[PDB]
């Protein structure tokens, strides 16, 4: 959370494995894995979304047999904050791996290449 | 402890019999078969035994190799507008018969896969032009990997896909692969869809094929010829063989009956009557 | 690291000095780090078909009869 | 025999837009490759081909306004047509395959073609 | 000594008991008994949800009618219970389903009748489509009939209207509706339901899929096809009718991956 | 040393966790933390339903709005729960059923606001009608909201419509909606979310009742009520406004007598 | 003594809990 | 001079006299003095990813406050 001190506020970010209609509203999200997060003096929340899958490995493509599910921030209050202090700010995002995470299966990468 | 080229049972010496004991009456019902020897209807005699199974066991039964697709290619007059001269083929064993059927008798199978390529070549308008030997290129793009646009574009640098530079004339190709499947083992048959239809969706976006999954995506073999264009035209083939080593297989099925049609089990009509005629009491 | 096995003999040539007789064994050695690599032992095993051909819950002993 | 019916061909002005269709009589259980050709002169031209799903290739004339798709279960494939130009006149066909990503004028057979005519000003 | 018997049985799950005088033994497919996932064998993390006694019990499906002309009948697991109670309820909450059943046929005559239904488990029972324009193109809806189940034809008739194709499964009878021969199915986990001897027939399926746990409502694991191997006739009679009730109920079934409920579109 | 706090908590339970800073303890009811049914204390003889992690988890009931005016809001266990995944179905199921809860009371604001609420959880929490005519009347329906929940008001109005009476409760808040003074709530478990101290409440209770198993669908073991004891005030605004939201996961509940599901009439 | 080889950590069972322990909160300020 | 290291095996023949149990191994040879010649072993080490993870001078302690 990148707002100011005086800023307070409660989030629920949301992990919904796949194969249901993907959480438009809170009232969905909040049935799969979640977590609420209480902004703070620690300025930063952790989800892990944890491995829940069908097949062993899942494809590196968009692909549905090995389809991942959804993930989702909603409000669970709101954000408030007092007088002379901006309404509007800004989160920031991070993706990482966990100690039980592997990959498979080298091969050519789509993002880059040589016109000619 | 038993081996597949172990001797099978010795037959052993049985007399008459007169008594309550009746293996030959059974129920089928029960789902069960009757084990029954040769003795338990008749007399026998002391046979040492010294047939064994040792060529019907999984490994021995899938030893063979077999060709899967003929992947072609071919050149013009000149350039004149085209210079698309590439194959690409989607890697599945679902092409032909024999090799498919084989892999039918059961459910599901794990193995090591060995393929070999033979690679061959030849003229098209009689002509005193001269070929010098080719070099072929096999590369193999998994699933998700840039697919060849033109023949001479990046994507043939190969820098991380395995590829196999074939030169014209040795001894043929070949690499082996190991249990590359997304499960614990493959599938040679799924009874459902890749996509749950929503209510809340449209019919479309919810649409899959029956009996299709990403369980056997494995990928495409792109091939080309290395050489630069010739003035003479030189058309090749490469004809892939599989053979399916440290084999595992589970779940035993009744084998395809009538023709095999598309990738699914699918039938056609006029191939549904496999047997012939015969009467009842004709030997 | 060579692996040696026995071969079963089939067709024996006059000899025991040599061939036929004194177990004729095979030599093998593993030259890549991949397994998938490796050639077919086909040293494999067999196994009572029972799974698939009694596979009723209470034991089938043949003498007797089967519904009882 | 084996049979390819080309439709929705018509006379349109520049700038246009088509999308002509072909499918097979009965199923094909072999082929998986289909391509569209045109002609105008007495040279045939390929113009675009599709395999399966969802590798597509074009030529250098065709790309970018022209767009090939067909279904990964029926044999059956389309050719989107758009900012269609007064070059593009001619005669379209269709044709199956085998494995064949690239194209060349060698088909066994032939069905019959649709008409395209682009009209200019 | 007591009267013990192959033929008398009582089978016990959750909150139902289902009783016979006349059985056949029953059969554990494959010899394997059902049971939860091992954690050598593991995939999904997060704690699964195991229902037992809410899930693991009887539920008897609609009952079905057996005349003359009855070509055969077949079910998909586990697709047929997709809406009996808690068991249907986990199935579609969570991404993630296994489960093994007890599958017991029911179907009952009179010394004075004869026939022969040939009861089969086949695991990953893919069935032939009906048309000859378009392969697997039969819809999730004509694939899961749930409950109602669906039929085996004596005939293959090729949809023909291309323009709104029926998508369905043309499933014949002496092919299996799969193309192979039924003389074969044989060597699916099976029972056979004669008149004369017995009037059921019990099938104790594991879950059995390439996977440890896979999703319950994109994939059956298992099939029931039930097929007359000898046609039904009654004292002399044209045209006699029996019933057929199939009760079925999962076993060591266990759930991963908890979200909104899924809302299938089944029509 | 390391920095842990009675403001800074973390509650995970099945597939969700919650966070938070500004916490000020969190109370046990009682001293009783939730239990399953004791052999030595059991009532059904049925083997019971556990679901464990399929219910035994965070839901998140609508989030209401605190003004100036509010009067305070009223919930009640299991019925506000009566639509939440799983746990709804598994009791709508079951005849009876028993289980321990954890409710978080969510409300945050600013170091410039100022106001405080009173979270108790009554056992029994039985309120007062609408009527002057009849006693005892409010109907099924009103009597039990689900999770919208109903409010608490400032002045008793008797319902005088006695061709069509409302049946309805009208709680009167510092009679605490059940004709007792406001000011002993405290005697029930509870907590003060104080605005310039903490931003939530946390009780979590046992379950209570004079059985060891009860239906659920007709009695609400414990009642959550949420009144304003200093009014909401900020900056030098008229009116300011500020969500609460309730988050509440059952507890080691169990179920008994399985049957086909209770369809009842809510509305 | 790891190789590239060797299993990754296994999953080990957790119940509930409800502590003054908080592995969710952090601060990437730190740069961890 | 010989090396014969083992192979991680992954698909199992149905073998146990032969192949797939009893420790597959594999053997190398170097025939060249220089080691650039070498081909590669791939018997690799892997190491705790702190050093990018968690680069922090004071250790951190998961289930405590970060800041503190
Ligand atoms: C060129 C190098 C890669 C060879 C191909 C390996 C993977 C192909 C998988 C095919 C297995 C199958 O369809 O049965």
């Known amino acids: 959370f990148c707002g100011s001190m005086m800023a307070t506020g409660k989030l629920l970010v949301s992990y919904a494995p796949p194969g249901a209609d993907p959480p438009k509203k809170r009232k969905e999200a909040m049935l799969g894995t979640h977590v609420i997060w209480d902004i703070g003096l620690q300025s930063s929340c952790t989800m892990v979304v944890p491995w829940i899958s069908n097949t062993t490995y899942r494809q590196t493509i968009d692909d549905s047999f090995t389809e991942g599910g959804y993930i989702s921030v909603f409000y669970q209050t709101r954000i408030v904050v007092p007088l002379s202090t901006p309404r509007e700010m800004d989160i920031l995002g991070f993706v990482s791996a966990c100690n039980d995470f592997s990959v498979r299966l080298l091969r050519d990468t789509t993002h880059i290449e040589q016109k000619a | 402890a038993a081996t597949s080229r172990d001797a099978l049972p010795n037959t052993e010496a049985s007399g008459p019999t007169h008594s309550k004991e009746i293996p030959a009456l059974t129920a089928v019902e029960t789902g069960a078969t009757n084990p029954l020897v040769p003795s338990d209807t008749v007399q026998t005699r002391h046979v040492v035994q010294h047939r064994s199974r040792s060529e019907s066991s999984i490994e021995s039964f899938f030893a063979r190799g077999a060709c899967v697709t003929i992947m072609t290619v071919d050149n013009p007059a000149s350039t004149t507008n085209k210079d698309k001269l590439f194959a690409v083929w989607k890697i599945t064993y679902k092409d032909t018969v024999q090799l498919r059927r084989k892999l039918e008798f059961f459910t599901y199978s794990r193995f090591d896969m060995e393929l070999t390529f033979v690679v061959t070549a030849n003229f098209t308008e009689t002509n005193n032009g001269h070929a010098l030997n080719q070099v072929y290129q096999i590369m193999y793009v998994p699933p998700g990997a840039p697919v060849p646009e033109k023949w001479d574009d990046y994507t043939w640098q190969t820098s991380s896909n395995p590829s196999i530079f074939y030169t014209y004339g040795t001894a043929p190709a070949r690499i082996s692969v190991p249990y590359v499947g997304i499960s614990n083992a493959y599938s040679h048959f799924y009874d459902g869809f890749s996509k749950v239809p929503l209510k809340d969706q449209s019919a479309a976006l919810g649409d899959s094929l029956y009996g299709a999954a990403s369980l056997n995506d494995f990928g495409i073999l792109a091939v080309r010829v290395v050489n630069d264009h010739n003035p003479t035209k030189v058309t090749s083939k490469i004809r892939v063989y599989l053979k399916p080593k440290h084999i595992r297989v589970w779940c035993p099925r009744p084998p395809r009956a009538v023709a095999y049609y598309g990738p699914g089990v699918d039938y056609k009509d006029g191939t549904l009557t496999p047997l012939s005629t015969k009467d009842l009491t004709t030997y | 690291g060579a692996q040696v096995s026995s071969q079963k003999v089939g067709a024996h040539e006059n000899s025991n000095r040599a061939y036929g007789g004194s177990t004729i064994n095979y030599t093998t050695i593993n030259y890549y780090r991949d397994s998938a690599s490796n050639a077919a032992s086909k040293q494999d095993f067999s196994q009572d078909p029972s799974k698939f051909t009694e596979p009723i819950k209470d034991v089938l002993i043949k003498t007797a009869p089967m519904l009882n | 025999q084996v049979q390819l019916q080309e439709s929705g061909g018509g006379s349109v002005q520049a700038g246009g837009s088509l999308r002509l269709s072909c499918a097979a009589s009965?199923?094909?259980?072999?082929?998986?490759?289909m391509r569209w050709f045109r002609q105008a002169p007495k040279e045939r031209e390929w113009v675009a081909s599709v395999?399966?799903?969802?590798?597509?290739w074009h030529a250098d004339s065709v790309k970018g306004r022209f767009t090939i798709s067909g279904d990964n279960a029926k044999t059956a494939a389309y050719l989107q047509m758009n900012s269609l130009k007064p070059e593009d006149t001619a005669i379209y066909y269709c044709?199956?395959?085998?494995?064949?990503?690239?194209?060349?004028?060698?088909?066994?057979?032939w069905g019959q073609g649709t008409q395209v005519t682009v009209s200019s000003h | 000594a007591c009267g013990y018997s192959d033929r008398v049985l009582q089978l016990t799950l959750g909150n139902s008991t289902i009783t016979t005088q006349e059985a056949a033994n029953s059969v554990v497919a494959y010899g394997r008994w059902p049971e939860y996932l091992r954690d050598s064998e593991a995939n999904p993390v997060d704690q699964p949800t195991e229902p037992d006694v809410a899930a693991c019990r009887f539920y008897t499906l609609d009952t079905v009618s057996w005349t003359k002309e009855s070509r055969g009948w077949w079910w998909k697991l586990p697709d047929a219970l997709r809406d009996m109670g808690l068991f249907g309820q986990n199935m579609y909450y969570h991404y993630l389903g296994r489960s093994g059943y007890t599958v017991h046929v029911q179907c009952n005559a009179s010394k004075f009748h004869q026939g022969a239904l040939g009861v089969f488990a086949v695991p990953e029972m893919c069935l032939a489509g009906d048309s000859n324009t378009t392969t697997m193109h039969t819809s999730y809806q004509n694939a899961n009939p749930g409950e109602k189940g669906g039929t085996f034809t004596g005939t293959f008739t090729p949809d023909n209207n291309q323009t709104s194709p029926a998508r369905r499964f043309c499933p014949v009878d002496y092919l299996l509706g799969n193309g192979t021969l039924l003389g074969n199915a044989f060597v699916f986990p099976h029972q056979i339901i004669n008149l004369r001897t017995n009037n059921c027939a019990t099938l104790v399926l594991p879950y059995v899929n390439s996977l440890s746990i896979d999703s319950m409502v994109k994939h059956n694991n298992w099939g029931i096809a039930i097929l007359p191997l000898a046609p039904l006739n009654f004292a002399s009679e044209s045209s006699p009718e029996i019933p057929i009730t199939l009760t079925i109920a999962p076993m060591c079934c266990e759930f991963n991956g908890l979200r909104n409920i899924t809302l299938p579109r089944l029509q | 040393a390391c920095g842990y706090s009675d403001r800074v908590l973390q509650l995970t339970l099945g597939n969700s966790t919650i966070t938070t800073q500004e916490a000020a303890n969190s109370v046990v009811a009682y001293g009783r933390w939730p239990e399953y049914l004791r052999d030595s204390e059991a009532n059904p003889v049925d083997q019971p339903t556990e679901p464990d992690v399929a219910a035994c988890r965070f839901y998140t009931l609508d989030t209401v709005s605190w003004t100036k005016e509010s009067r305070g809001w009223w919930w009640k266990l299991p019925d506000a729960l009566r639509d939440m995944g799983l746990f709804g179905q598994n009791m709508y199921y079951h005849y009876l059923g028993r289980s321990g809860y954890t409710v978080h009371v969510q409300c945050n604001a600013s170091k410039f606001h100022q106001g405080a609420l009173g979270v108790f959880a009554v056992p029994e929490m039985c309120l007062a009608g609408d009527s002057n005519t009849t006693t005892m009347h409010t109907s099924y329906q009103n009597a039990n909201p689900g999770e919208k929940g109903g409010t608490f008001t400032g002045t008793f109005t008797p319902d005088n419509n006695q061709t069509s009476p409302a049946r309805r409760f009208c709680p009167v808040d510092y009679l605490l909606g059940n004709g007792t003074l406001l000011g002993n709530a405290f005697v029930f478990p509870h907590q003060i979310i104080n605005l310039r101290t903490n931003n939530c409440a946390t009780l979590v209770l046992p379950y209570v009742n004079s059985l060891s198993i009860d239906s659920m669908v007709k009695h609400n073991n414990w009642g959550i009520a949420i009144l304003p004891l200093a009014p909401l005030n900020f900056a030098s605004e008229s009116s300011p406004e500020i969500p609460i939201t309730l988050t509440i996961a059952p507890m080691c509940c169990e179920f008994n007598g399985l049957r086909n599901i209770t369809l009842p009439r809510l509305q | 003594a790891a190789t590239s080889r060797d299993a990754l950590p296994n999953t080990e069972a957790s119940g509930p809990t409800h502590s003054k322990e908080i592995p969710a909160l952090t601060a990437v300020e730190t740069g961890a | 001079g010989a090396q014969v290291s083992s192979q991680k095996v992954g698909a199992h023949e149905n073998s146990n006299r032969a192949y797939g149990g009893s420790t597959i191994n594999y053997t190398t040879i170097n025939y060249y003095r220089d080691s650039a010649s070498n081909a590669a072993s791939k018997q690799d080490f892997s190491q705790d990813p702190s050093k990018f993870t968690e680069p922090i001078k004071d250790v951190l302690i998961k289930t405590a406050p970060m800041l503190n």
């Open positions: 395999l399966r799903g969802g590798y597509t």
């Open positions: 009965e199923y094909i259980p072999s082929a998986n490759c």
């Open positions: 044709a199956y395959s085998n494995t064949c990503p690239g194209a060349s004028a060698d088909f066994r057979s």
